[PDB]
Structures are given as C-alpha cells and as structure tokens.
Amino acid sequence: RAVRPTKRIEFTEADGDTEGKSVFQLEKETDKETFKIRDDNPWVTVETNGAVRVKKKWDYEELGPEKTIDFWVIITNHNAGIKYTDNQRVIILVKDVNDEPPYFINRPLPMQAVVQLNAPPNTPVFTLQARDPDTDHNIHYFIVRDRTGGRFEVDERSGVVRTRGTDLFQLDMEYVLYVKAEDQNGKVRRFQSTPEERLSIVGGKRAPQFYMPSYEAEIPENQKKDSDIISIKAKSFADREIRYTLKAQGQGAGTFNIGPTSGIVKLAKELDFEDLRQPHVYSLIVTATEDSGGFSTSVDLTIRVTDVNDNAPKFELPDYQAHNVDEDIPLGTSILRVKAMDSDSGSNAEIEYLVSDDHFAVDSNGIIVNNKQLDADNNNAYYEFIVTAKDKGEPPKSGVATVRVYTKN
Ligand SMILES: [Ca+2]
Ligand SMILES: [Ca+2]
Ligand SMILES: [Ca+2]
Ligand SMILES: [Ca+2]
Ligand SMILES: [Ca+2]
Ligand SMILES: [Ca+2]
C-alpha cells in the first residue's frame, strides 16, 4: 500500500456549476481498483469507479486564498494477486468566472435625496454605489427610466447623479429616477445587473427616513425590565436633530417606551405570555419627528413575545384519597383518577405522571392503577405515596400531591 503522486488539475468555477456533474475521472492503475474519498469534502464526492462529482456548486467567491478543492482519495484492491489500499491527494485549481451579479450598497433603501430649489445646472444630488463579488468586475451606472422629464443625469463610472438645466425645482415635488448598475465584464449576451431601484428626489425639503423600512424583534416573556429591545435610527435630509415617540394599535401601550434622542427601545413593564389581556404580537408605531422644523415619518415595529416554562403543573386537589379498596383486587384496577394542569403552552404544558410507590402505576390519563398484590406485606392496610406531574419543559418543572389508599379484607 503506497502513496501515489498527487493529482493536479485545473477547472473554472462554471465547470462545477451543476450538482452531481462528473467533472473528471481519477487515474486508474489497473481496471479492478476502486475509489472512495478519504473524508468529507464540501465540493466533491467520489464514485467507486473514480468519477469526481460536484457536491456543492463550485464557487470561486467562497474558496480560500489558495482557491483549491483539496482532498484525499483511498484506492482499494481478491483474485488480482497483489492486494493494497493506496492513498492519493487530489488538488483542483479553480479559476474565476464572472458569475455573480452586482448589488447597490446605498443605505437606507429606498434611495432618497433632496434637490435645492434653485440648484445650478450640474449640482450633485446623490451617488449610486454598487459592489460586485467577482475579481474583474466592471461597474457601470445608468438611469434606465426617467420621470423628471430630463432634469437629471448620472455619471456612468462614479455613479454621481446631478441636475441638468437651469429651471427651478418645485418645493415638495418628487422627481423619480429608476436606476441600475451593471457589470459589463459578465453576461447571461445580456449584462449582469442589479434589480432596478427607485431613486426619490424631492424638491427643497423632505421628511426623515428610517434606516430600515420596518422593524421586528422576538423577545422572551421573562426578559428583565429596562433592558434594551431594539434600537431605531432615522436620518434627516437637512441635518436637523430627531426625537422619537411610540404608539400601539390597539393592544397594550405602556408596555414599551423609546429613548428620547438615542432611539433605543426598552421594556417598561414585566411581561406574561400567560396573561390573556396582553397579546403575543405587539404592533407598534414609531415616529421620528424634527422638532426643529415640523416634518415627521412613521414606521411599523412588531414585537413577538415567546412562552417560557415559568409554570409548574398543579394538581386540581391538594391530596387524593381512596377508601374501602379491597386488597385482593386483581392487578390493573383503577383505584382513583388524578389530574393536574399547566399554564404554559406546547410541551411546556405536556404532562407525564409518576408514582413513588411501585405498588401502583399511573398512565398519561392520570388513572392510578393497582401494580402489585395489595394483600401481601400490608399489616396496617394503608398506602401513602406521592404522585408527580412533570412537564416536558427545559428544564422540566414538577407538581406533587399525596395519595392515600385505605384497604380492607
Ligand atoms: Ca461563484
Ligand atoms: Ca466568480
Ligand atoms: Ca460580476
Ligand atoms: Ca408567565
Ligand atoms: Ca410548565
Ligand atoms: Ca409560560
């Protein structure tokens, strides 16, 4: 059994573009020998005949600096005379292909700017910025569709949008441009491209814009007061300072509040998933107002509260007692029924039953049964033991109750 010289081979990304594709064949030294990969590899699998097949679609952008798929292969070989189990290393060099589309990095989205009312021609107003994962990208900027009527133009390389013409812009009017960025070093004979984006240019002045079109957060019911839930941030287009406020529709306001200037949302009142009067989903409205101006804008903020196993199963009675039980009762007789309830939900409310005295047994329905003869070793004619109701929470909480069984002959 020997190490064989390393196999070196070269391919482009695209060659490995189809899951399961047999890209190439490993070299055999006799017909009879078979192949198996030495360890998992994310990019390739190996058939017993030597075929190297794509596992995960090959990706230059996701390989390390070496840009190789590097793996070992076991080669095995009765009736052939000489037996062995060989090792060979296999190194595929992966060449780049322009295969990933460009994407805008402008934030926030949608894209928004303002234009000064009497802006001279060629005033810069916005700067489109795209990025492209491929090594040899070639980003070109375009206005694909104009709804200003021709009052703007973009520089194809810098992505700067600037005014055209001398006419004034109208206060509060929106001027709309649909823009794209494309990578001209890659195609599909059609160039790789961002989705069309809507660039909103408003004359003179506009309301603030939040950094996200909406906000959401899922928090547990047991999370402490005054703790930070989510922080919200808006931008002014005239560099005014901003102050936030919050509302509800129409379930439980006062539960949350917001930081005056810093936008951080905190928990104000302790929560309870078990409290019906509080909802499980909190629909909130956050408005960012310019108190140095007048303008303001709203954004939805949704908070989901989750169940924690804060409740233990409770038995309906504090203790259970059965009387006049004949001791000769055949095994399997219902002696008494027991029941316990749990406030939580799902499996935090799922209930299993146990019994501390192996003379009895109990099923998922709480039926306490006779598990051994009751007439043997029972001088005082009486059993006293504990039932547990145990939930399926993590960790599980328990409820317990005394059970008394008085027997007789
Ligand atoms: Ca790729
Ligand atoms: Ca590529
Ligand atoms: Ca590209
Ligand atoms: Ca609770
Ligand atoms: Ca529980
Ligand atoms: Ca709970």
Side-chain angles (χ1 to χ4, degrees), residues 2-156 158-223 225-242 244-268 270-372 374-409:
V3 184
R4 286 176 193 191
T6 301
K7 196 194 162 62
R8 282 180 164 94
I9 202 166
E10 186 178 301
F11 283 111
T12 90
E13 218 171 350
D15 298 325
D17 64 348
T18 317
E19 279 166 52
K21 186 178 156 187
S22 295
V23 179
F24 71 99
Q25 188 81 41
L26 289 164
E27 285 131 311
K28 284 207 178 99
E29 293 206 357
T30 326
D31 202 7
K32 279 281 295 307
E33 68 183 31
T34 55
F35 294 82
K36 186 190 147 290
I37 200 171
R38 185 133 101 4
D39 322 84
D40 294 331
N41 180 287
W43 307 108
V44 287
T45 67
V46 176
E47 291 298 325
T48 69
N49 78 350
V52 180
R53 302 175 79 175
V54 172
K55 201 180 199 170
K56 180 180 183 162
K57 280 175 264 201
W58 291 3
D59 202 338
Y60 187 87
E61 285 65 56
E62 229 231 325
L63 287 164
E66 291 178 334
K67 300 291 178 189
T68 60
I69 303 165
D70 187 321
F71 63 94
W72 283 86
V73 144
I74 301 164
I75 307 159
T76 306
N77 189 7
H78 189 268
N79 233 3
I82 167 184
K83 288 138 183 165
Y84 56 77
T85 294
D86 282 351
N87 287 2
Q88 196 180 27
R89 192 179 194 164
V90 180
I91 313 176
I92 315 176
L93 194 54
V94 182
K95 289 283 142 161
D96 195 23
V97 177
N98 194 324
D99 67 322
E100 314 297 337
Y103 55 92
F104 285 110
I105 63 174
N106 301 75
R107 293 297 177 269
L109 295 178
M111 302 172 176
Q112 308 179 179
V114 291
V115 56
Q116 177 210 343
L117 302 174
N118 58 330
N122 286 176
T123 290
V125 133
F126 200 80
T127 303
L128 304 171
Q129 285 288 280
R131 286 312 186 269
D132 186 290
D134 291 295
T135 54
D136 75 325
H137 62 73
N138 185 3
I139 299 166
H140 285 249
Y141 297 97
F142 295 103
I143 287 164
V144 289
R145 210 154 44 94
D146 187 351
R147 299 175 85 59
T148 66
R151 299 302 316 281
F152 287 99
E153 79 190 35
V154 66
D155 184 278
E156 184 168 346
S158 74
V160 172
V161 187
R162 47 137 86 143
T163 67
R164 303 171 79 244
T166 50
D167 283 345
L168 314 176
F169 294 81
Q170 296 192 36
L171 173 76
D172 217 13
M173 216 221 210
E174 183 184 40
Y175 302 84
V176 174
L177 299 172
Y178 297 89
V179 290
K180 70 164 174 185
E182 65 181 21
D183 175 12
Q184 288 185 357
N185 277 16
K187 19 166 79 177
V188 187
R189 300 263 283 218
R190 210 88 145 195
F191 290 134
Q192 285 175 6
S193 206
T194 66
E196 247 184 45
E197 285 289 341
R198 189 196 190 272
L199 174 53
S200 174
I201 311 169
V202 162
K205 256 176 276 171
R206 84 191 294 159
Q209 187 187 20
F210 290 89
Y211 275 92
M212 284 302 203
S214 63
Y215 296 91
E216 195 164 354
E218 182 179 303
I219 63 174
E221 73 164 326
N222 69 341
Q223 107 151 43
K225 260 171 61 166
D226 193 22
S227 58
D228 306 275
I229 310 304
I230 191 171
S231 53
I232 297 158
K233 198 187 162 204
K235 61 168 275 188
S236 171
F237 291 90
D239 309 295
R240 333 292 298 197
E241 283 211 60
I242 301 142
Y244 306 94
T245 62
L246 38 46
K247 197 171 76 280
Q249 321 90 295
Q251 261 293 243
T255 330
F256 298 92
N257 59 44
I258 196 166
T261 348
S262 78
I264 307 172
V265 172
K266 281 174 212 171
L267 181 62
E270 284 144 43
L271 304 146
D272 194 20
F273 190 88
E274 279 70 62
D275 195 314
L276 269 139
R277 300 182 268 90
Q278 291 152 283
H280 293 153
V281 170
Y282 281 74
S283 315
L284 309 181
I285 291 280
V286 180
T287 73
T289 187
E290 294 173 4
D291 211 308
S292 47
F295 264 117
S296 74
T297 41
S298 289
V299 71
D300 287 298
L301 178 254
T302 303
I303 287 158
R304 289 170 215 275
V305 193
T306 41
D307 175 38
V308 313
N309 188 46
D310 50 1
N311 283 284
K314 318 207 231 288
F315 286 96
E316 301 179 321
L317 310 186
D319 57 286
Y320 298 85
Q321 204 178 343
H323 272 274
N324 305 293
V325 189
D326 289 313
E327 59 186 27
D328 63 354
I329 51 161
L331 306 93
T333 330
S334 308
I335 282 160
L336 81 153
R337 202 203 183 102
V338 136
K339 202 192 192 144
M341 287 287 91
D342 193 320
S343 297
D344 303 312
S345 308
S347 64
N348 293 327
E350 203 90 33
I351 294 157
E352 201 215 332
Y353 292 104
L354 320 167
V355 153
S356 67
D357 204 315
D358 66 6
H359 284 270
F360 307 86
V362 65
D363 64 12
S364 76
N365 284 299
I367 298 172
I368 289 184
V369 105
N370 178 24
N371 188 47
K372 288 171 185 173
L374 261 36
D375 53 0
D377 198 77
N378 189 26
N379 191 53
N380 288 322
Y382 169 85
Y383 297 88
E384 193 198 64
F385 63 91
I386 300 180
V387 225
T388 305
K390 187 207 240 283
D391 71 39
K392 298 200 195 303
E394 195 36 58
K397 296 221 192 301
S398 273
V400 281
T402 306
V403 179
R404 298 184 296 284
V405 180
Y406 294 79
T407 56
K408 54 142 191 168
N409 62 319

PDB file of all heavy atoms in Angstrom, residues 168-182:
ATOM      1  N   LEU A 168     -36.038  75.999 -12.116  1.00  0.00           N
ATOM      2  CA  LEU A 168     -36.100  75.732 -10.694  1.00  0.00           C
ATOM      3  C   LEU A 168     -36.794  74.398 -10.437  1.00  0.00           C
ATOM      4  O   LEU A 168     -37.569  73.915 -11.261  1.00  0.00           O
ATOM      5  CB  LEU A 168     -36.813  76.871  -9.965  1.00  0.00           C
ATOM      6  CG  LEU A 168     -36.415  78.315 -10.303  1.00  0.00           C
ATOM      7  CD1 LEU A 168     -37.296  79.321  -9.550  1.00  0.00           C
ATOM      8  CD2 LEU A 168     -34.930  78.573 -10.036  1.00  0.00           C
ATOM      9  N   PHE A 169     -36.489  73.787  -9.305  1.00  0.00           N
ATOM     10  CA  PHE A 169     -37.222  72.611  -8.884  1.00  0.00           C
ATOM     11  C   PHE A 169     -38.360  73.042  -7.949  1.00  0.00           C
ATOM     12  O   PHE A 169     -38.276  74.087  -7.287  1.00  0.00           O
ATOM     13  CB  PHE A 169     -36.276  71.595  -8.258  1.00  0.00           C
ATOM     14  CG  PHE A 169     -35.278  71.026  -9.235  1.00  0.00           C
ATOM     15  CD1 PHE A 169     -34.118  71.734  -9.568  1.00  0.00           C
ATOM     16  CD2 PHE A 169     -35.496  69.791  -9.836  1.00  0.00           C
ATOM     17  CE1 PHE A 169     -33.197  71.223 -10.478  1.00  0.00           C
ATOM     18  CE2 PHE A 169     -34.569  69.264 -10.748  1.00  0.00           C
ATOM     19  CZ  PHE A 169     -33.417  69.989 -11.065  1.00  0.00           C
ATOM     20  N   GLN A 170     -39.436  72.263  -7.926  1.00  0.00           N
ATOM     21  CA  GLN A 170     -40.626  72.637  -7.167  1.00  0.00           C
ATOM     22  C   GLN A 170     -40.659  72.045  -5.760  1.00  0.00           C
ATOM     23  O   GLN A 170     -40.507  70.830  -5.568  1.00  0.00           O
ATOM     24  CB  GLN A 170     -41.891  72.276  -7.935  1.00  0.00           C
ATOM     25  CG  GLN A 170     -42.030  73.046  -9.229  1.00  0.00           C
ATOM     26  CD  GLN A 170     -43.407  72.916  -9.843  1.00  0.00           C
ATOM     27  OE1 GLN A 170     -44.423  72.857  -9.140  1.00  0.00           O
ATOM     28  NE2 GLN A 170     -43.451  72.878 -11.168  1.00  0.00           N
ATOM     29  N   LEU A 171     -40.866  72.925  -4.782  1.00  0.00           N
ATOM     30  CA  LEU A 171     -40.940  72.528  -3.386  1.00  0.00           C
ATOM     31  C   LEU A 171     -41.870  71.337  -3.227  1.00  0.00           C
ATOM     32  O   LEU A 171     -43.000  71.332  -3.731  1.00  0.00           O
ATOM     33  CB  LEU A 171     -41.406  73.695  -2.507  1.00  0.00           C
ATOM     34  CG  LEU A 171     -41.698  73.385  -1.035  1.00  0.00           C
ATOM     35  CD1 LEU A 171     -40.406  73.220  -0.248  1.00  0.00           C
ATOM     36  CD2 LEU A 171     -42.553  74.468  -0.433  1.00  0.00           C
ATOM     37  N   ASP A 172     -41.359  70.312  -2.558  1.00  0.00           N
ATOM     38  CA  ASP A 172     -42.155  69.167  -2.147  1.00  0.00           C
ATOM     39  C   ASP A 172     -42.523  68.218  -3.283  1.00  0.00           C
ATOM     40  O   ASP A 172     -43.177  67.206  -3.062  1.00  0.00           O
ATOM     41  CB  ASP A 172     -43.405  69.625  -1.376  1.00  0.00           C
ATOM     42  CG  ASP A 172     -43.760  68.687  -0.237  1.00  0.00           C
ATOM     43  OD1 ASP A 172     -42.911  67.817   0.133  1.00  0.00           O
ATOM     44  OD2 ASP A 172     -44.890  68.822   0.288  1.00  0.00           O
ATOM     45  N   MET A 173     -42.088  68.525  -4.496  1.00  0.00           N
ATOM     46  CA  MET A 173     -42.359  67.623  -5.594  1.00  0.00           C
ATOM     47  C   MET A 173     -41.319  66.516  -5.667  1.00  0.00           C
ATOM     48  O   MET A 173     -40.128  66.761  -5.489  1.00  0.00           O
ATOM     49  CB  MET A 173     -42.410  68.362  -6.912  1.00  0.00           C
ATOM     50  CG  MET A 173     -43.444  67.777  -7.838  1.00  0.00           C
ATOM     51  SD  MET A 173     -42.784  67.714  -9.501  1.00  0.00           S
ATOM     52  CE  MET A 173     -44.306  67.895 -10.439  1.00  0.00           C
ATOM     53  N   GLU A 174     -41.780  65.298  -5.926  1.00  0.00           N
ATOM     54  CA  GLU A 174     -40.890  64.161  -6.044  1.00  0.00           C
ATOM     55  C   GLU A 174     -40.469  64.011  -7.496  1.00  0.00           C
ATOM     56  O   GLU A 174     -41.293  64.082  -8.396  1.00  0.00           O
ATOM     57  CB  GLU A 174     -41.577  62.891  -5.538  1.00  0.00           C
ATOM     58  CG  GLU A 174     -40.695  61.653  -5.545  1.00  0.00           C
ATOM     59  CD  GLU A 174     -41.432  60.376  -5.119  1.00  0.00           C
ATOM     60  OE1 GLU A 174     -42.606  60.183  -5.510  1.00  0.00           O
ATOM     61  OE2 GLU A 174     -40.826  59.552  -4.393  1.00  0.00           O
ATOM     62  N   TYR A 175     -39.178  63.820  -7.720  1.00  0.00           N
ATOM     63  CA  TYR A 175     -38.672  63.538  -9.056  1.00  0.00           C
ATOM     64  C   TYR A 175     -38.089  62.137  -9.042  1.00  0.00           C
ATOM     65  O   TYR A 175     -37.162  61.851  -8.278  1.00  0.00           O
ATOM     66  CB  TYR A 175     -37.602  64.548  -9.465  1.00  0.00           C
ATOM     67  CG  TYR A 175     -38.055  65.986  -9.454  1.00  0.00           C
ATOM     68  CD1 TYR A 175     -38.043  66.729  -8.277  1.00  0.00           C
ATOM     69  CD2 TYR A 175     -38.472  66.613 -10.628  1.00  0.00           C
ATOM     70  CE1 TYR A 175     -38.449  68.052  -8.266  1.00  0.00           C
ATOM     71  CE2 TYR A 175     -38.874  67.937 -10.630  1.00  0.00           C
ATOM     72  CZ  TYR A 175     -38.863  68.654  -9.446  1.00  0.00           C
ATOM     73  OH  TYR A 175     -39.263  69.976  -9.436  1.00  0.00           O
ATOM     74  N   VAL A 176     -38.631  61.268  -9.889  1.00  0.00           N
ATOM     75  CA  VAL A 176     -38.325  59.855  -9.789  1.00  0.00           C
ATOM     76  C   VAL A 176     -37.396  59.381 -10.888  1.00  0.00           C
ATOM     77  O   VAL A 176     -37.597  59.681 -12.064  1.00  0.00           O
ATOM     78  CB  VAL A 176     -39.609  59.011  -9.705  1.00  0.00           C
ATOM     79  CG1 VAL A 176     -39.304  57.520  -9.759  1.00  0.00           C
ATOM     80  CG2 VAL A 176     -40.356  59.336  -8.418  1.00  0.00           C
ATOM     81  N   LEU A 177     -36.363  58.654 -10.476  1.00  0.00           N
ATOM     82  CA  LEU A 177     -35.449  58.012 -11.404  1.00  0.00           C
ATOM     83  C   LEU A 177     -35.370  56.537 -11.061  1.00  0.00           C
ATOM     84  O   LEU A 177     -35.225  56.175  -9.892  1.00  0.00           O
ATOM     85  CB  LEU A 177     -34.045  58.623 -11.321  1.00  0.00           C
ATOM     86  CG  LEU A 177     -33.840  60.104 -11.635  1.00  0.00           C
ATOM     87  CD1 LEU A 177     -32.425  60.499 -11.288  1.00  0.00           C
ATOM     88  CD2 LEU A 177     -34.174  60.418 -13.108  1.00  0.00           C
ATOM     89  N   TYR A 178     -35.484  55.694 -12.079  1.00  0.00           N
ATOM     90  CA  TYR A 178     -35.207  54.276 -11.927  1.00  0.00           C
ATOM     91  C   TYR A 178     -33.794  54.044 -12.440  1.00  0.00           C
ATOM     92  O   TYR A 178     -33.467  54.395 -13.562  1.00  0.00           O
ATOM     93  CB  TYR A 178     -36.262  53.433 -12.664  1.00  0.00           C
ATOM     94  CG  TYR A 178     -37.648  53.643 -12.078  1.00  0.00           C
ATOM     95  CD1 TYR A 178     -38.479  54.654 -12.550  1.00  0.00           C
ATOM     96  CD2 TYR A 178     -38.104  52.863 -11.014  1.00  0.00           C
ATOM     97  CE1 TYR A 178     -39.728  54.870 -11.989  1.00  0.00           C
ATOM     98  CE2 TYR A 178     -39.350  53.078 -10.449  1.00  0.00           C
ATOM     99  CZ  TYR A 178     -40.150  54.082 -10.941  1.00  0.00           C
ATOM    100  OH  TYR A 178     -41.388  54.294 -10.392  1.00  0.00           O
ATOM    101  N   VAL A 179     -32.947  53.486 -11.594  1.00  0.00           N
ATOM    102  CA  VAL A 179     -31.532  53.358 -11.900  1.00  0.00           C
ATOM    103  C   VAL A 179     -31.126  51.894 -11.847  1.00  0.00           C
ATOM    104  O   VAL A 179     -31.818  51.071 -11.231  1.00  0.00           O
ATOM    105  CB  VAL A 179     -30.648  54.156 -10.883  1.00  0.00           C
ATOM    106  CG1 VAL A 179     -30.807  55.665 -11.072  1.00  0.00           C
ATOM    107  CG2 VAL A 179     -30.962  53.743  -9.432  1.00  0.00           C
ATOM    108  N   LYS A 180     -30.006  51.562 -12.488  1.00  0.00           N
ATOM    109  CA  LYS A 180     -29.420  50.231 -12.356  1.00  0.00           C
ATOM    110  C   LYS A 180     -27.917  50.379 -12.407  1.00  0.00           C
ATOM    111  O   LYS A 180     -27.410  51.390 -12.880  1.00  0.00           O
ATOM    112  CB  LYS A 180     -29.912  49.263 -13.449  1.00  0.00           C
ATOM    113  CG  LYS A 180     -29.380  49.586 -14.845  1.00  0.00           C
ATOM    114  CD  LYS A 180     -29.544  48.418 -15.827  1.00  0.00           C
ATOM    115  CE  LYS A 180     -29.145  48.825 -17.250  1.00  0.00           C
ATOM    116  NZ  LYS A 180     -29.404  47.747 -18.228  1.00  0.00           N
ATOM    117  N   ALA A 181     -27.216  49.378 -11.892  1.00  0.00           N
ATOM    118  CA  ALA A 181     -25.791  49.260 -12.062  1.00  0.00           C
ATOM    119  C   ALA A 181     -25.567  47.913 -12.709  1.00  0.00           C
ATOM    120  O   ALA A 181     -26.214  46.925 -12.337  1.00  0.00           O
ATOM    121  CB  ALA A 181     -25.106  49.326 -10.731  1.00  0.00           C
ATOM    122  N   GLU A 182     -24.676  47.861 -13.693  1.00  0.00           N
ATOM    123  CA  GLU A 182     -24.377  46.593 -14.356  1.00  0.00           C
ATOM    124  C   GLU A 182     -22.876  46.285 -14.398  1.00  0.00           C
ATOM    125  O   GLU A 182     -22.042  47.192 -14.354  1.00  0.00           O
ATOM    126  CB  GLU A 182     -25.019  46.521 -15.752  1.00  0.00           C
ATOM    127  CG  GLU A 182     -24.475  47.526 -16.753  1.00  0.00           C
ATOM    128  CD  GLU A 182     -25.148  47.460 -18.124  1.00  0.00           C
ATOM    129  OE1 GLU A 182     -26.287  46.935 -18.225  1.00  0.00           O
ATOM    130  OE2 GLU A 182     -24.530  47.949 -19.098  1.00  0.00           O
TER     131      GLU A 182
END
